[PDB]
C-alpha cells in the first residue's frame, strides 16, 4: 500500500545538535534598548522586550498607537515601524535575538559530570576551564612552536612565547581561541589516531576514554555535526508570550524575572560593543565577555554557578530550564498538571435491585457532572436556544431537562475508576441509572474483584467525553465483559458474601424436611413449592434432570439422568445455561467451589450465559441469607464439655512439672518449653472438641429415627462456604487464645487458658495488649513502602509493550508442576493457562502431540495437561523473546481482559509490575511413601554393601514417585547417604519406609572394598588418638586442616584400600587411586586393619520468607551468606592452608584445569573430596544468590529458580501468578548485555540485549570473517535497571532530568519520542492500541521516501 | 485535553455544549516551553510528510 | 439497554479502528453527513453506532 502525503498525524522528533544558522531561522527582530519601561507613561518600551517590530502586535491586529484596526490590512507594513498586525498567539512563535559580542562556551558540556569536551581534547577540567575563565592564552595551531596544540599560557609566558616565536604563532584566550582550535580539528584524523591507540594501549585509563571519545565522534558522524558550532554566538529571546508586563493601581509594574535578565544581557551587550567603538584592550573587552558569558548562562538555567537573583529581592530567578524542570521531573504536564475536568468523588452502598451491568448514581450529583452533554443534546433535539438559555434550563429544574436527563444517563458507558488502584482490573465500567439516594449503589457480585464491601469505599466516577472512552468502556472495561484475570482463570463475578452463604441455605441438607420422600418431575414447580413454602428446601426428592455437555463440534450432546437432590439445588438448576454440566453444581457448595462453578461455565460455553446466570442467583441468594440470620452477642457462643476438662488435666499436669522441678528431673528452661508443648497439646485437644461438637451434634427425626445432620449453627455455615473472617480466630474466641508475644520478643511461658465467650483476665489480656500493638503498627507502615516498591517496578518495565507479531526464537522456559515434598504444590495448569506453547509438548506416548508449539493455551488444552502423564511442558516467555524493543503477540499469548489474541500495542510490562506489586501489599525422619506404587530413583550414584542394603554416595538423590499410571506424584530431596531398604521398581505399601536417611551422620562411604590402611595419615600430625572408651573398635579422629603440624597442614589425609592379597586398588569407575581424603574435624569410623565393604562408613563428616527478602531479590543485595557452588567440575582437593583464604583446587580432565577458588576455609566445606563433584555441586549449604546461579550454571536455571523462590514467598502467601509477569521484571533487569568479545562496539561496551542480537546477526556474514562480538546476559536490580534508561525524557519526568538530558545530547541520540512516558509528558499518542495503528503507518513513513 | 491543555478544554467545551462526539489534540503549551528553550542552544524540531 | 456488546467486538476485531469508524460516523449524524437510519430511542448517537456494528451494515 501507499500512505498519505498530507498531514494526518504528528511524527518522530530528532534530537542531536544544530548549527547557529538553523537558530537564526526564527529571529524576527533585534532587541536594542534593554529597558522594558517608559517610566513615565505606564507603557511598553519599543525596541525592547515589549516591542512591536521585534516581537509582535500588542493586541490582535491592534496597533499600540491604535492606528490599524480592520482585518484587510493584516499585513501592511508602516514605512517607519515595520510591524505586521497579527494574532497574539503568533506572539509565542515570534522569537528575537541578541547578536553576541562574546564567544560563549557550553557551560553544560564543560562543567556537567559528562566532561565531553574534556576527554575529547585529551585534557583535564581545570586547564580547559582556565581558558574559559579568561586566565590563559590557549595556543591555536602552532606546529613546531614552544607549546602543544592544546596547552595554556600565563601573562608572563605569553609575552616570552612571542619573543621566542613571533612567526607561525598565534594564541588567544577564551572561547574565541577555543573556536579557532575546533575550526582546525579534522575529526577523521583524530579518529584514526584513536585507532592507533586502539591497537597500542589496551589500558583502561586511556582505552575507556578511547571508547567514550570515539563513540562521541561516531555519533556526530551519524548526525553530521561539528565541534565548531559548539561555540554559542546567537542568543534568542523567548517571546512576550512567556513573560508578561502589567501596570497596577499605584504606579508599579509586574514585570517577570526573565525581563530583568534580558535587560541585563542586552545592556552589557551594547556595553561590550561600546568597548569596540572606543577600542579597549583584550584584558578589558574579555572582562565584559566574562559578564556577557554569565549573561547567556543566567538566561538558560544559569548552568551551574549560583542561580542569578534579581535586584533587591532574595529569590533565585525562574529561568528557562526552571520553566521546564520543577515538581516530579517535568513540572507542569506531570506533577499537578491542570485540574481534571469531568469527574468526581463518592461513597458506595447496597442498592440490591441494580442489575449486574448497571450501577446507580444519585440524581443531583449526576446532574452536576453530565451538564455538558445535556446542553448539546438540548439544542440537537430542538428544545434549547443557546448554551446560555440551556444553563438557565438546569437553573430552573425544568421538567424538560428531566426527560432529557433520562436520555443521556440511562445508557452511558462510564468509567468507575479508583485512583489508588495498584491493579489494572480495579478500573472498570458500568451503566448509571436515575437512583434516589446519596451514594453509588453497586452490584454485590463485583465487590470480590474490588475487594471491598458496603461500608465506606470511596470511588470516583469518570465521564467519557468522547465515544473513544465510551466504546472501550462497555467493550473492554464493562464488568460483564471481562470476567477473567491476568493471573489465571479468575472469574470477576463470584459470590463471596452472605449471599453465597444464602445459597448454602439453598443447597443445605438435613433430614428434618417435609416432603422428603416424594418424587419430582419439574424444577419450575419446585420453586413454586417454596414460593408458597410447603415442602422444605431441605427435602430429598428424586429429580428428573436434563444434562447438557458439548463434546461435539457445535453441538451439546445431552443425556437422561435420574438423581436425588434437595429442593434447593432443584430451584438452582432452573436458570443454568446449557453449557454448564450438572456435575459441577451437585456438591457441598463453598466459596471457591461456586467460583469454579462459573469458571467452567465460561471456559466451556461463553460470556453472556454467565451474565444472566450471575444476576438471578444474586437475588435468590439474598432471600435465603435473610432466612438465615446468623446471631451473636453473649447468647450464641458455646463452651465444650471437653475443653474445661482437658485444661484441668493439663492444669494439675503442669503442677506436676512444677513438682518435677522441685525434685530435679527437668531444667528450668526445659520446664518452660515443656509446659508450652503440653498447653499447646491441650490447645489442639480443645480443637478436637469444639469441631466434632460444632459439626454434627444437631440431630432430628424424620422418616425413621433421629438422623445426624450437619449442625445448623451459623459458625458451621461460616466454616463451610465463608464470607469474611477466619474460623481459626473464631476458634480462639470460643476456645483458649493460646500464646502471644511477650514485651521482650519471645513467646509467653504462661499461656492464656481462658476463652472470649467469657471475659478473660486483666493481666493476661494486658500481655495480649502487647499483641495488639504489634499488628496495628506493621500494617500501617508496610503499605506505604510497598507502593514505592511497585514504583521502581514500573520505573523499569514501562518500556515493554507488545510491538511485533512474530519473533523468531524456538526457545522458552520449562514450566513444570514443581512438586516438593508430598503432593504437587504449584500445579502445571495455573502456570501454563493463558500463555503460548514454546514447543510441541508430548503425551505419555511419543509421536502424538497434545499441544502443538503454536497453540492458544486455554481451558481445553489445560484439561489435556491434566488428564495425561505429561510432567514437562515448556512454555515460552518474554525472557527468551527474540523481539527487539518489546514482545510479539506469539510470545505473550491470549492473556488479557479478553481470552483471545493479545492486542498488538497492549502494554504488558506495566500491567505486570502492578501484577507483582499487587501481592506486594500483602507482604510484611524418613522418606516413607504415602502412595502405593513403583519407587523410582532419579540420578543417583548408588552402591550395595554387606547384608544387602543401598547406601548413597551422592547428594542430589531425587526420589520420584511413579504410580500405576505413570504420572509423577511425589518427589523428595534426599540428602547425602541414605539407607535404602526397598529397591528400584518394587511395589511398596502406603506407610512403609523405602528411603531411610540419617541427618546426623554424613559419612564418606567407599565404593572400593578390602582392608583399610591409612596412608599419609600420621598418628599425631594429621590424625589424633582419642579413642572412644566404650566401643572396642579403635578410630582416628581427623583434626581440622588448621590445627595440624606445619608440614601436616599441606597433607591430604588419605584413606587407601587394598584387596585380599596386598595391592593398591583403584576406584571402580575412575583411574585415580582409592584416595578418599577426609575434610577437617571429621572423625574416621575405622582404623588400620578393619575389613570394610563397598558402602561402609569410614569417615563421619558433621554439620527469611518475607518482603525484605523480596527486597533483597529486587535490589541484587548481597545477602548474609552466598551459597558456595563449584564454579567448575571434576576431582577436588584443598590448597594452601592457614595463611589466608582457602584455595579449593577443583581440576577437571578436559576443561579449565588449574582453576582453584577463593573460599574462606572457616565456612562449611561440605565438598566431597572423595567423590567427583559436579560444576554446580554443594560445596557449602544454604540459600544461593541470583548473580551466581545466572552466570556459571545457566540462564534458564536461574530465572526458573527465581520464579520458584519468589513464588515460594507467595507459597507462604498462597498466591498463583501467571509467571510471564514475574519474568517481565526479570527481563528488564537483564536488559544489559555486556558485549564481551572484541568486535565492533568495543571490548567492554554494555548494550541492549536486543541491539546486540541484531549486531551479531549482520556481522557474522560478509565483509568480515569471525569478528562478531559475543554478548553476556547480566543480572541486575530494578533500582539499577530502571536507572539504565536510554530515553532521556522519561528520566526527565521522575529520575535525574538534567544528567540524562545531557547524557543523550552529548552524542546526539535522536530518540524519535517513541514510547509511553515520552508521549505522556508531551501529551500525544503512545505507540499502543490505536496509537500504534498510526505508528505502524508511521513506521513505513519514517526514515523512508 | 482532559488534563493538560488550558486551551484544549476551552476549545472543546464550547463544542461539547453544542454536541460533537470526538476530539482533537492541538498543541500543548508545555512543549512550547521546552521547545523554544532548546532553540536557544541549537536544536531543530522536524515534522515532514 | 445493552448488557453485552461482545457481538460488536467480533464483527470488527480492531476494537480501536472500530472507534475511529463510529467516530467519523457520529460526525455525519451531527455535522451534516446523513440522518440516522434506525429510528433512535433515547440512546445517544454513540450507542446508535454500537448497534449498527452488531448488525454489521456500516463499518
Curated annotation (Swiss-Prot), chain A:
GO biological process: DNA-templated transcription
Enzyme kind, highest EC tier: transferase
UniProt: Mg(2+) binding residues: 453, 455, 457
Catalysed reactions listed for this entry: RNA(n) + a ribonucleoside 5'-triphosphate = RNA(n+1) + diphosphate
Modified residues (N6-acetyllysine): 949
Names of required cofactors: Mg(2+); Zn(2+)
Documented EC number(s): 2.7.7.6
GO cellular component, one term: DNA-directed RNA polymerase complex
Domain of life: Bacteria
Record's keyword terms, sorted: Acetylation, DNA-directed RNA polymerase, Magnesium, Metal-binding, Nucleotidyltransferase, Transcription, Transferase, Zinc
Protein residues bound to Zn(2+) 1: 63, 65, 78, 81
Cofactor note: Binds 1 Mg(2+) ion per subunit. Binds 2 Zn(2+) ions per subunit.
Annotated positions binding Zn(2+) 2: 807, 881, 888, 891
Gene3D superfamilies membership: 1.10.132.30, 1.10.150.390, 1.10.1790.20, 1.10.40.90, 2.40.40.20, 2.40.50.100, RNA polymerase II, clamp domain, RNA polymerase Rpb1, domain 3
MF annotations from Gene Ontology: DNA binding; DNA-directed RNA polymerase activity; magnesium ion binding; zinc ion binding
Subunit composition and interactions: The RNAP catalytic core consists of 2 alpha, 1 beta, 1 beta' and 1 omega subunit. When a sigma factor is associated with the core the holoenzyme is formed, which can initiate transcription.
Role, per record: DNA-dependent RNA polymerase catalyzes the transcription of DNA into RNA using the four ribonucleoside triphosphates as substrates.
Family: Belongs to the RNA polymerase beta' chain family.
Protein name per Swiss-Prot or TrEMBL: DNA-directed RNA polymerase subunit beta'
Organism: Escherichia coli O157:H7
Name of the gene this protein is made from: rpoC
From Swiss-Prot, chain B:
Transmembrane stretches, start-end: none
Record-annotated disulphide pairs: none
UniProt superkingdom: Bacteria
Family (UniProt): Belongs to the RNA polymerase beta chain family.
Subunit structure: The RNAP catalytic core consists of 2 alpha, 1 beta, 1 beta' and 1 omega subunit. When a sigma factor is associated with the core the holoenzyme is formed, which can initiate transcription.
Cited function: DNA-dependent RNA polymerase catalyzes the transcription of DNA into RNA using the four ribonucleoside triphosphates as substrates.
Name of the protein: DNA-directed RNA polymerase subunit beta
Organism: Escherichia coli O45:K1 (strain S88 / ExPEC)
Lineage: Bacteria, Pseudomonadati, Pseudomonadota, Gammaproteobacteria, Enterobacterales
Gene of this entry: rpoB
Curated annotation (Swiss-Prot), chain C:
E.C. numbers: 2.7.7.6
Alphabetized UniProt keyword annotations: DNA-directed RNA polymerase, Nucleotidyltransferase, Transcription, Transferase
GO (cellular component) term, any one: DNA-directed RNA polymerase complex
Listed GO MF terms: DNA binding; DNA-directed RNA polymerase activity
Reactions this protein catalyses: RNA(n) + a ribonucleoside 5'-triphosphate = RNA(n+1) + diphosphate
Domain of life the protein comes from: Bacteria
GO BP field: DNA-templated transcription
Disulfide bond in keyword set: no
Function recorded in the entry: Promotes RNA polymerase assembly. Latches the N- and C-terminal regions of the beta' subunit thereby facilitating its interaction with the beta and alpha subunits.
Family: Belongs to the RNA polymerase subunit omega family.
Complex and partners: The RNAP catalytic core consists of 2 alpha, 1 beta, 1 beta' and 1 omega subunit. When a sigma factor is associated with the core the holoenzyme is formed, which can initiate transcription.
Protein name, UniProt field: DNA-directed RNA polymerase subunit omega
Record lineage: Bacteria, Pseudomonadati, Pseudomonadota, Gammaproteobacteria, Enterobacterales
Amino acid at each position: 500500500l501507499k500512505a498519505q502525503t498530507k498531514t494526518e498525524e504528528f511524527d518522530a522528533i530528532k534530537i542531536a545538535l544544530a548549527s547557529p544558522d538553523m537558530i537564526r531561522s526564527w529571529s524576527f527582530g533585534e532587541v536594542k534598548k534593554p529597558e522594558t519601561i517608559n517610566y513615565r507613561t505606564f507603557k511598553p518600551e519599543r525596541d525592547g522586550l515589549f516591542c512591536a517590530r521585534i516581537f509582535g502586535p500588542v493586541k490582535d491586529y491592534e496597533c499600540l498607537c491604535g492606528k490599524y484596526k480592520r482585518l484587510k490590512h493584516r499585513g501592511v507594513i508602516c514605512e517607519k515601524c515595520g510591524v505586521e498586525v497579527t494574532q497574539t498567539k503568533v506572539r509565542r512563535e515570534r522569537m528575537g535575538h541578541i547578536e553576541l559580542a562574546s564567544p560563549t562556551a557550553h557551560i553544560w558540556f564543560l562543567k556537567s559530570l559528562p566532561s565531553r569536551i574534556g576527554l575529547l581534547l585529551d585534557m583535564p577540567l581545570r586547564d580547559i576551564e582556565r581558558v574559559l575563565y579568561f586566565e590563559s592564552y590557549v595556543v591555536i595551531e602552532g606546529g613546531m612552536t614552544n607549546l602543544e596544540r592544546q596547552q595554556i599560557l600565563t601573562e608572563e609566558q605569553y609575552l616570552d612565547a612571542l619573543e621566542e616565536f613571533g612567526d607561525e604563532f598565534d594564541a588567544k584566550m577564551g572561547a574565541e581561541a577555543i573556536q579557532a582550535l575546533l575550526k582546525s580539528m579534522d575529526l577523521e584524523q583524530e579518529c584514526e589516531q584513536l585507532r592507533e591507540e586502539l591497537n597500542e594501549t589496551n589500558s583502561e585509563t586511556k582505552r575507556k576514554k578511547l571508547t567514550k571519545r570515539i563513540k562521541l565522534l561516531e555519533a556526530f558522524v551519524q548526525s553530521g555535526n561539528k565541534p565548531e558550532w559548539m561555540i554559542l554566538t546567537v542568543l534568542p529571546v523567548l517571546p512576550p508570550d512567556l513573560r508578561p508586563l502589567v501596570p497596577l493601581d499605584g504606579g508599579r509594574f509586574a514585570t517577570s524575572d526573565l525581563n530583568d535578565l534580558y535587560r541585563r544581557v542586552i545592556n552589557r551587550n551594547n556595553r561590550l560593543k561600546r568597548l569596540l567603538d572606543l577600542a579597549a584592550p583584550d584584558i578589558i573587552v574579555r572582562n565584559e565577555k566574562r559578564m556577557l558569558q554569565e549573561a547567556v548562562d543566567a538566561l538558560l538555567d544559569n548552568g551551574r554557578r549560583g542561580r542569578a537573583i534579581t535586584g533587591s529581592n532574595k529569590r533565585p530567578l525562574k529561568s528557562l530550564a526552571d520553566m521546564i524542570k520543577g515538581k516530579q521531573g517535568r513540572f507542569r504536564q506531570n506533577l499537578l498538571g491542570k485540574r481534571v475536568d469531568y469527574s468526581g468523588r463518592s461513597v458506595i452502598t447496597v442498592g440490591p435491585y441494580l442489575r449486574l451491568h448497571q450501577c446507580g448514581l444519585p440524581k443531583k450529583m449526576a446532574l452536576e457532572l453530565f451538564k455538558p452533554f445535556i446542553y448539546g443534546k438540548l439544542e440537537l433535539r430542538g428544545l434549547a436556544t443557546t448554551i446560555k438559555a440551556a444553563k438557565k434550563m438546569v437553573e430552573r429544574e425544568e421538567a424538560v431537562v428531566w426527560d432529557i436527563l433520562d436520555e443521556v444517563i440511562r445508557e452511558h458507558p462510564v468509567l468507575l475508576n479508583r485512583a489508588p488502584t495498584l491493579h489494572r482490573l480495579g478500573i472498570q465500567a458500568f451503566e448509571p441509572v436515575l437512583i434516589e439516594g446519596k451514594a453509588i449503589q453497586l452490584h454485590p457480585l463485583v465487590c470480590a474483584a474490588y475487594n471491598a464491601d458496603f461500608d465506606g469505599d470511596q470511588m470516583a466516577v469518570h465521564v467519557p467525553l468522547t465515544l473513544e472512552a465510551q466504546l472501550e468502556a462497555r467493550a473492554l472495561m464493562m464488568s460483564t465483559n471481562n470476567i477473567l484475570s491476568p493471573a489465571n482463570g479468575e472469574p470477576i463475578i463470584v459470590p463471596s458474601q452472605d449471599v453465597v452463604l444464602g445459597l448454602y441455605y439453598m443447597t443445605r441438607d438435613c433430614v428434618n424436611a417435609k416432603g422428603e420422600g416424594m418424587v419430582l418431575t419439574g424444577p419450575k414447580e419446585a420453586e413454586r413449592l417454596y414460593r408458597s413454602g410447603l415442602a422444605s428446601l431441605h427435602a430429598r426428592v428424586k429429580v428428573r434432570i436434563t444434562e447438557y455437555e458439548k463434546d461435539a463440534n457445535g453441538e451439546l450432546v445431552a443425556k437422561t439422568s435420574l438423581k436425588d437432590t434437595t429442593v434447593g439445588r432443584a430451584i438452582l438448576w432452573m436458570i443454568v445455561p446449557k453449557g454448564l454440566p450438572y456435575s459441577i453444581v451437585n456438591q457441598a457448595l463453598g466459596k471457591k467451589a461456586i467460583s469454579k462453578m462459573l469458571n467452567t461455565c465460561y471456559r466451556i460455553l461463553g460470556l453472556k450465559p454467565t451474565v444472566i446466570f450471575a444476576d438471578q442467583i444474586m437475588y435468590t441468594g439474598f432471600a435465603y441469607a435473610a432466612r438465615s440470620g446468623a446471631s451473636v452477642g453473649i447468647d450464641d457462643m458455646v463452651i465444650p464439655e471437653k475443653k474445661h476438662e482437658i485444661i484441668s488435666e493439663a492444669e494439675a499436669e503442669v503442677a506436676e512439672i512444677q513438682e518435677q522441678f522441685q525434685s530435679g528431673l527437668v531444667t528450668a528452661g526445659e520446664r518452660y518449653n515443656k509446659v508450652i508443648d503440653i498447653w499447646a497439646a491441650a490447645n489442639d485437644r480443645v480443637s478436637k472438641a469444639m469441631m466434632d461438637n460444632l459439626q454434627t451434634e444437631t440431630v432430628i427425626n424424620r422418616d425413621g429415627q433421629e438422623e445426624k445432620q450437619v449442625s445448623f449453627n451459623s459458625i458451621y455455615m461460616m466454616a463451610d462456604s465463608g464470607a469474611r473472617g477466619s474460623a481459626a480466630q473464631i476458634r480462639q474466641l470460643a476456645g483458649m487464645r493460646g500464646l502471644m508475644a511477650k514485651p521482650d520478643g519471645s513467646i509467653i511461658e504462661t499461656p492464656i487458658t481462658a476463652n472470649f465467650r467469657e471475659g478473660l483476665n486483666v493481666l493476661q489480656y494486658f500481655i495480649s495488649t502487647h499483641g495488639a500493638r504489634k499488628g496495628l503498627a506493621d500494617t500501617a507502615l508496610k503499605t506505604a513502602n510497598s507502593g514505592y516498591l511497585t514504583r521502581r517496578l514500573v520505573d523499569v518495565a514501562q518500556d515493554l509493550v507488545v510491538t511485533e507479531d512474530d519473533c523468531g526464537t524456538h526457545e522458552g522456559i520449562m514450566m513444570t508442576p514443581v512438586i516438593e515434598g508430598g503432593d504437587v504444590k504449584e500445579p502445571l495448569r495455573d502456570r501454563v493457562l493463558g500463555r503460548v506453547t514454546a514447543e510441541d509438548v508430548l503425551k505419555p506416548g511419543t509421536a502424538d502431540i497434545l499441544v502443538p508449539r503454536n497453540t492458544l493455551l486455554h481451558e481445553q488444552w489445560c484439561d489435556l495437561l491434566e488428564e495425561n502423564s505429561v510432567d514437562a511442558v515448556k512454555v515460552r516467555s518474554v525472557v527468551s523473546c527474540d523481539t527487539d524493543f518489546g514482545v510479539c503477540a506469539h510470545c505473550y499469548g491470549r492473556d488479557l481482559a479478553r481470552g483471545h489474541i493479545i492486542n498488538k500495542g497492549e502494554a504488558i510490562g506495566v500491567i505486570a509490575a502492578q501484577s507483582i506489586g499487587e501481592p506486594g501489599t500483602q507482604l510484611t525422619s524418613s522418606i516413607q511413601v504415602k502412595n502405593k506404587g513403583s519407587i523410582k530413583l532419579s540420578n543417583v550414584k548408588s552402591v550395595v554393601n554387606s547384608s544387602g542394603k543401598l547406601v548413597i554416595t551422592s547428594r542430589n538423590t531425587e526420589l520420584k514417585l511413579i504410580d500405576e499410571f505413570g504420572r509423577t506424584k511425589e518427589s523428595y530431596k534426599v540428602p547425602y547417604g541414605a539407607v535404602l531398604a526397598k529397591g528400584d521398581g518394587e511395589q511398596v505399601a502406603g506407610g512403609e519406609t523405602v528411603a531411610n536417611w540419617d541427618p546426623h551422620t554424613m559419612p564418606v562411604i567407599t565404593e572400593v572394598s578390602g582392608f583399610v590402611r591409612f596412608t599419609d595419615m600420621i598418628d599425631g600430625q594429621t590424625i589424633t588418638r582419642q579413642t572412644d572408651e566404650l566401643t572396642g573398635l579403635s578410630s582416628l579422629v581427623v583434626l581440622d586442616s588448621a590445627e595440624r603440624t606445619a608440614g601436616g597442614k599441606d597433607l591430604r589425609p588419605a584413606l587407601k584400600i587394598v584387596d585380599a592379597q596386598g595391592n593398591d586398588v583403584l576406584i571402580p569407575g575412575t583411574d585415580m587411586p582409592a584416595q578418599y581424603f577426609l575434610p577437617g574435624k571429621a572423625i574416621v569410623q575405622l582404623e588400620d586393619g578393619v575389613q570394610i565393604s563397598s558402602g561402609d562408613t569410614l569417615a563421619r563428616i558433621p554439620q527469611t520468607g518475607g518482603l525484605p527478602r523480596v527486597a533483597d531479590l529486587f535490589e541484587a543485595r548481597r545477602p548474609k551468606e552466598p551459597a558456595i557452588l563449584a564454579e567448575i567440575s571434576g576431582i577436588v582437593s584443598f590448597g594452601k592452608e592457614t595463611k589466608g583464604k582457602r584455595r579449593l583446587v577443583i581440576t577437571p580432565v578436559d576443561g579449565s584445569d588449574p582453576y582453584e577458588e577463593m573460599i574462606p576455609k572457616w565456612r562449611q566445606l561440605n565438598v566431597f573430596e572423595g567423590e567427583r563433584v559436579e560444576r554446580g555441586d554443594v560445596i557449602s549449604d544454604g540459600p544461593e544468590a541470583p548473580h551466581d546461579i545466572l552466570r556459571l550454571r545457566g540462564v534458564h536455571a536461574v530465572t526458573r529458580y527465581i520464579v520458584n523462590e519468589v513464588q515460594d514467598v507467595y507459597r507462604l502467601q498462597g498466591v498463583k501468578i501467571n509467571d510471564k509477569h514475574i519474568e517481565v521484571i526479570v527481563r528488564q533487569m537483564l536488559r544489559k548485555a555486556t558485549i564481551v568479545n572484541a568486535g565492533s562496539s568495543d571490548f567492554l561496551e554494555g548494550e541492549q540485549v536486543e541491539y546486540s542480537r541484531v549486531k551479531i546477526a549482520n556481522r557474522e556474514l560478509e565483509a568480515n570473517g569471525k569478528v562478531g562480538a559475543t554478548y553476556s546476559r547480566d543480572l541486575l536490580g530494578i533500582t539499577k535497571a530502571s536507572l539504565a534508561t536510554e530515553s532521556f525524557i522519561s528520566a526527565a519526568s521522575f529520575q535525574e532530568t538534567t544528567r540524562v538530558l545531557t547524557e543523550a545530547a552529548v552524542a546526539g541520540k535522536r530518540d524519535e519520542l517513541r514510547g509511553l512516558k515520552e508521549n505522556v509528558i508531551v501529551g500525544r499518542l503512545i505507540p499502543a492500541g490505536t496509537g500504534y495503528a498510526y505508528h505502524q503507518d508511521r513506521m513505513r513513513r519514517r526514515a523512508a521516501g | 485535553v482532559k488534563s493538560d491543555d488550558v486551551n484544549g478544554r476551552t476549545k472543546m467545551y464550547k463544542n461539547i455544549v453544542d454536541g460533537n462526539h470526538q476530539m482533537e489534540p492541538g498543541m500543548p503549551e508545555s512543549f512550547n516551553v521546552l521547545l523554544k528553550e532548546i532553540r536557544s542552544l541549537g536544536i531543530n524540531i522536524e515534522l515532514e510528510d | 439497554a445493552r448488557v453485552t456488546v461482545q457481538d460488536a467486538v467480533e464483527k470488527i476485531g480492531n476494537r480501536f479502528d472500530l472507534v475511529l469508524v463510529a467516530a467519523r460516523r457520529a460526525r455525519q449524524m451531527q455535522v451534516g453527513g446523513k440522518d440516522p437510519l434506525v429510528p433512535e430511542e433515547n440512546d445517544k448517537t454513540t450507542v446508535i453506532a454500537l448497534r449498527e456494528i452488531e448488525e454489521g451494515l456500516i463499518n
